[PDB]
Amino acid sequence: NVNCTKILQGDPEEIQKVKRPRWTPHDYINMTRDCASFIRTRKYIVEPLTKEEVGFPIAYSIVVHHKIEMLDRLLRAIYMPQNFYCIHVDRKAEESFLAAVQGIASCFDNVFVASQLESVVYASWTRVKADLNCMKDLYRMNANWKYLINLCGMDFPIKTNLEIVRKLKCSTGENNLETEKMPPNKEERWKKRYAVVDGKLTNTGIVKAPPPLKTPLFSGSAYFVVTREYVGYVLENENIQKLMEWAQDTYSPDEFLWATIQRIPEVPGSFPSSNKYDLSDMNAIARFVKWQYFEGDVSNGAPYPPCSGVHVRSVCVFGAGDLSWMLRQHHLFANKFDMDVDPFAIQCLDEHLRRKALE
Amino acid sequence: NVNCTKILQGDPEEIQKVKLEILTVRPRWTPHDYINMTRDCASFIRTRKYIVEPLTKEEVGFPIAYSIVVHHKIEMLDRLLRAIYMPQNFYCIHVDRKAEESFLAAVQGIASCFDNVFVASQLESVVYASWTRVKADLNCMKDLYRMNANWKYLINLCGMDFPIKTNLEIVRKLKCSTGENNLETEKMPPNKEERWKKRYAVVDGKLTNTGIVKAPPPLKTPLFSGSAYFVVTREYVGYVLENENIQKLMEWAQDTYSPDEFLWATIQRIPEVPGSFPSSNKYDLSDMNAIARFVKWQYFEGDVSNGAPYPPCSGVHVRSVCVFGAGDLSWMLRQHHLFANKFDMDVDPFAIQCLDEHLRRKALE
Ligand SMILES: CC(=O)N[C@@H]1[C@@H](O[C@@H]2O[C@H](CO)[C@H](O)[C@H](O)[C@H]2O)[C@@H](O)[C@@H](CO)O[C@H]1O
Ligand SMILES: CC(=O)N[C@@H]1[C@@H](O[C@@H]2O[C@H](CO)[C@H](O)[C@H](O)[C@H]2O)[C@@H](O)[C@@H](CO)O[C@H]1O
Prior knowledge:
The structure is a homodimer.
Chain A: H1 4-7, H2 12-18, H3 25-31, H4 35-41, H5 51-54, E1 58-64, H6 68-78, E2 84-89, H7 95-105, E3 111-113, H8 125-140, E4 147-152, E5 155-157, H9 161-170, E6 179-181, H10 188-191, E7 192-196, E8 201-207, E9 218-220, E10 225-227, H11 228-236, H12 238-247, H13 257-261, E11 287-288, E12 310-312, E13 315-317, H14 323-326, E14 333-335, H15 343-358
Parallel strand pairs in A: 1-2, 1-4, 2-3, 11-14
Antiparallel strand pairs in A: 4-10, 5-14, 6-9, 7-8, 12-13
Bound molecules: a molecule of 2 linked components (NGA-GAL) (2 copies).
Enzyme class (chain A): transferase
Region (Catalytic) (chain A): 57-359
GO molecular function (chain A): beta-1,3-galactosyl-O-glycosyl-glycoprotein beta-1,6-N-acetylglucosaminyltransferase activity; nucleotide binding
């Protein structure tokens, strides 16, 4: 009964009216037995919408571990025939979850499950390796995709696939990720060797050697928008390898490795290491994210308005109230959303992108 | 007499050749020559080869507006004007009143050959680093604003600027700006606060610090540091011309030093201003992140593979600002900026020469 168009306009009425039977992996394993029906019923798009999009193939590395129904909506939201989608399922997900992903992945020849799966531990190298596994497959399996966008189960796009290609063009062969001067408060992350003690990455207290790099370490996000040339480079380059193994025992390497690579002289699509080229999460186009401690009055020093949903680890899990402002940002994808916190943020967004993409 | 292609590819031997080409010595037009040449428009246009026919349907549907500020060197003005001329666009030229009558006449001369090119209805006597430099652009904005309502963005240029993107490339980046303004705007550095803390007066033709402390800015939002160059939407221009508060802000800045390097940067961070950015520093644009103007400063140049924003200047340095030599061209063309600064015919015509044909050759596709 909810009127989406109104939520998309900030209308306080709907926002308030907004602010149960749920599918399960088994329900998916069953819906996918017949691909043609799943696709038709779930209204997936299997026919390029424009030649412009067919001429600009994108690759995606989606790291997941549960919430099968979110993965379904996410994929459909960003699905196109010319693209390439490598799904990474955590080696620890529910066997039925895994089988459910395979069922969805096996209905499209451009969708598949990474040939190597890692058991992902929070803030550890494995998180990066998850994405690396996906890069290895996508890089070798095709040489025509322009950029690689890595996602996660709780991301959702706020742009159609057309708008994404156009912005990727505006990038003119350059990458686009958050990459800034190392905050002193995040240095402890890589100045000490870490290890998994009790399923938790802990500080061993051993001081690490300096990074085998002439370039300084930069700070960023785990999400990115890099060119195929970048991927091949971190995959092949003899030095990127020295750095990567050095980062293996650091805390949250995913939030400093990509951003540091982006500023290494020889890297395709990179930026000079002069802080004149630094990119903050708001300047970059990778992902729009609201951190608890920055929300406030945008008319007084705040990057963005306060969160209408809830917060998990200081990260705003969007609610129907956030949509209006969010949609006016330049980012490709927003994080995070949760069917268990507000399925309406996702529904309204979902339909909007589909309609806007069909007009 | 020299292979441009090589120069754009950064060939050391070739760059070295222009050096020998210069010292080892020509046609030099003057304001009068132009007053004569403009007598017959058909000929001037045809001869100087001005693209008087819209190139694509994509450009015709996306009108651009330019505000060019000049005071001398009429041959430079004509070259820059041809490099960016397009029938669908609009060009407002501001000639300094301290300029030679022959020069102003030359510009009035050229301007008459084009219905879309005109001299600003109000000319200022510009003083370096003074509020009058901001007033000149403001004078153009009003003329361009009232003259037409279909141009999307206004780009302000000075005499020594040259484009490094074709008009279509420019139109495309503007479409990508998706309605936002693009210009430098960063946290106000400490060493530049003195520019607006004290009052400034022109003494013997040079703006000097009176010592008289001034009232705080008429703003709830902070003061931002930037440059005199920008890219803004027809709405940004409209708002600054009609908005009350801004008036109080501008007049308050009339007695400041280089009001042009904090004024625009600041208005771009004001809530309600069309195409602005949150005051939060997460949205700060450095000169390299913005796309308005590529410019190298002597104290920043050096080993790019070691922290330097860009490599050493190949031309010369006027006031710490690099005047481009053929040698700078290669690296510069790979930057995302719309225009560069600065170029000097007397320092290296080859840099302007190659850059000139390359852009034309590329527009023609
Ligand atoms: C204060 C602090 O260290 N917070 C950490 C988070 O930092 C944010 O990182 C994002 C990157 O997209 C962005 O730079 C933001 O401005 C930062 O505040 C973040 O690193 C988090 C782990 O995901 O850990 C917090 O401790
Ligand atoms: C060191 C210093 O104060 N230099 C002044 C110039 O500063 C530069 O300003 C540009 C603006 O585009 C850019 O931000 C660069 O990083 C700065 O170094 C500049 O303000 C100039 C006046 O035009 O005066 C110099 O003294």
